[PDB]
Design an enzyme around this catalytic site. Structure first.
Site, PDB file in Angstrom:
ATOM      1  N   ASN A  44       0.868  -1.211   0.000  1.00  0.00           N
ATOM      2  CA  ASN A  44       0.000   0.000   0.000  1.00  0.00           C
ATOM      3  C   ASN A  44       0.894   1.248   0.000  1.00  0.00           C
ATOM      4  OD1 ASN A  44       0.252   0.270   3.143  1.00  0.00           O
ATOM      5  ND2 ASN A  44      -0.464  -1.810   2.720  1.00  0.00           N
ATOM      6  N   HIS A  48       3.649   2.411   1.129  1.00  0.00           N
ATOM      7  CA  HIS A  48       4.385   3.018   2.264  1.00  0.00           C
ATOM      8  C   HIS A  48       5.840   2.547   2.187  1.00  0.00           C
ATOM      9  CE1 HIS A  48       0.998   5.249   3.467  1.00  0.00           C
ATOM     10  NE2 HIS A  48       1.437   5.479   4.716  1.00  0.00           N
ATOM     11  N   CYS A  68       8.951   8.970   5.464  1.00  0.00           N
ATOM     12  CA  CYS A  68       9.467   9.385   4.143  1.00  0.00           C
ATOM     13  C   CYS A  68       8.424   8.951   3.103  1.00  0.00           C
ATOM     14  CB  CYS A  68      10.849   8.771   3.953  1.00  0.00           C
ATOM     15  SG  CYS A  68      11.576   9.001   2.316  1.00  0.00           S
TER      16      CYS A  68
END
Ligand SMILES: COC1=C(c2ccccc2F)C(=O)N(C(C)(C)C(=O)Nc2cccc(Cl)c2)C1
Ligand SMILES: COC1=C(c2ccccc2F)C(=O)N(C(C)(C)C(=O)Nc2cccc(Cl)c2)C1
Lengths: 260, 259
Positions: free
Chosen positions: B181, B183, B218
């Site tokens: 997803n 990340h 990030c």
């Protein structure tokens, strides 16, 4: 996994892990590449070969000689899902004096279907000088007993022209890209190639075919630029080369199909 | 793997793969971190929670709440070799309203000796606003039946000051650093932290302890600088921050032993 009954190929099963899949909830092609390489190392080890220089024999280890990939060809029909069990069978075949060839078949273990195929061409070079060498009778005598003698095929490139359509510049090996012998892992090239594919094409297609022709190896302190042009489904020409219009590292091609 | 007879911890065995080891011919700390995360998702999966937002309950998915890591603490006594079988036990524990904890024990599955320990603090935050929330009764109810109720501990940071002694600048997430997803994988931060450790120190020491405080995630298009200063065996203070003297991503510390 283990050698098959006849001792002429090697089979291993993997449960696709959570971190091994991208957006599609399926195995990335970097995961596939890693598993192909893992089942290779396990085959080499099971018959008494060393991973340093990718299945080093005796007269080889004696002459500081190694195998490196001239060419990798991977075709995926379906990417295994998170939690699925994939089965991979691998074997190696002599290519006379040119070098050797390793092939893989990927199956859904649960259902038996062929979900993927790979073939790679390996050539013998010196570990220290990085100079290529043909296969002598004495090195072939050491490995031929581990290979099927009758042909067994999993599958029965232009230089990109300036200007590239797309680029990803200043790619650096990280410590996790280096293997036990401090060599940039081959799976890294696949990732660096795909990094110059526009995000939108990754988002709406799946990679069906990649072909990579390896020209020279990236060292640890090297910096690489990844160059892609559309040639077309969607088809692409690929070039990896050292920063500063340095030497060609790899060229390649990919074929993508729309998602369902 | 599977839940244990009492259903309050999860156990999984891994065979260390060739590509999972570096020079010492032992599994990298990144590989360890990945196997911790995997036995974590397998645990969340086993008891019916969503892997997206790292073990979301029904009420959480309704309110757009996820778990994020505030802190990760890992100690390794021995890195398993190519071919070794490691067994990892993992459990979660309520920390009342502040959040939850996940702990792991690593074992040479042959000797049954403890080769490592990890612990993590996780906080609840709104996916969208990224605002931290304290855990309600309705979310705690949905997971407390899956946790040991009596304490079970696997283990019973200053901002780095300019100038940094060592740096690795311009670090970018690659496609393989991003999870299902989109990340940036928590384990990416470990690699980036270690990229600014000088090569000579990595060649002559093994990492024994790492601790990371996570400040913010990030994104895919972010660029990160990895800064390290010696504080001491060798100790280091670490800072990840966005290029352009941007916001702090992580702080941490590492302790290394000689080989
Ligand atoms: C020794 O001769 C070789 C064999 C071989 C022959 C029979 C049984 C076992 C073998 F390893 C082999 O597979 N070779 C090539 C170079 C083609 C190879 O793929 N090596 C390789 C090693 C590790 C990982 C990976 Cl991904 C590939 C050379
Ligand atoms: C649902 O509630 C939570 C549990 C939980 C409680 C009982 C049984 C199973 C569980 F997952 C849990 O472990 N949570 C935290 C955030 C601490 C976690 O570690 N999640 C997590 C998920 C995947 C990977 C990783 Cl590396 C971490 C929240």
């Amino acid at each position: 996994g283990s050698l098959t009954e006849d001792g002429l190929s090697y089979k291993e099963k993997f449960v696709v892990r959570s971190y091994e899949v991208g957006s599609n909830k399926t195995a990335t092609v970097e995961t596939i590449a890693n598993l192909l390489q893992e089942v290779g190392c396990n085959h080499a080890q099971s018959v008494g070969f060393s991973t340093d220089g990718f299945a080093t024999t005796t007269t080889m280890r004696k002459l500081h000689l190694i195998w490196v990939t001239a060419r990798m060809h991977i075709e995926i029909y379906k990417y295994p899902a998170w939690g699925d069990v994939v089965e991979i069978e691998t074997w190696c075949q002599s290519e006379g004096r040119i070098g050797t060839r390793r092939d893989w078949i990927l199956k859904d273990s649960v259902t038996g279907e062929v979900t993927g195929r790979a073939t790679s061409k390996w050539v013998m070079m010196n570990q220290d000088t990085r100079r290529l060498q043909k296969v002598s009778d004495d090195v072939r005598d050491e490995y031929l007993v581990f290979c099927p003698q009758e042909p067994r095929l999993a599958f029965p490139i232009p230089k990109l022209e300036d200007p590239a359509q797309y680029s990803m510049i200043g790619l650096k090996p990280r410590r996790a890209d280096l293997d036990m012998n401090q060599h940039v892992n081959n799976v890294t090239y696949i990732g660096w190639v795909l990094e110059s594919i526009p995000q939108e094409i990754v988002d709406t297609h799946e990679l069906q075919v990649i072909t990579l022709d390896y020209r020279r190896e990236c060292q640890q302190d090297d910096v690489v630029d990844s160059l892609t042009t559309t040639t077309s489904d969607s088809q692409f020409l690929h070039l990896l080369r050292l920063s500063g219009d340095g030497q060609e590292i790899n060229r390649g091609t990919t074929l993508w199909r729309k998602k369902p």
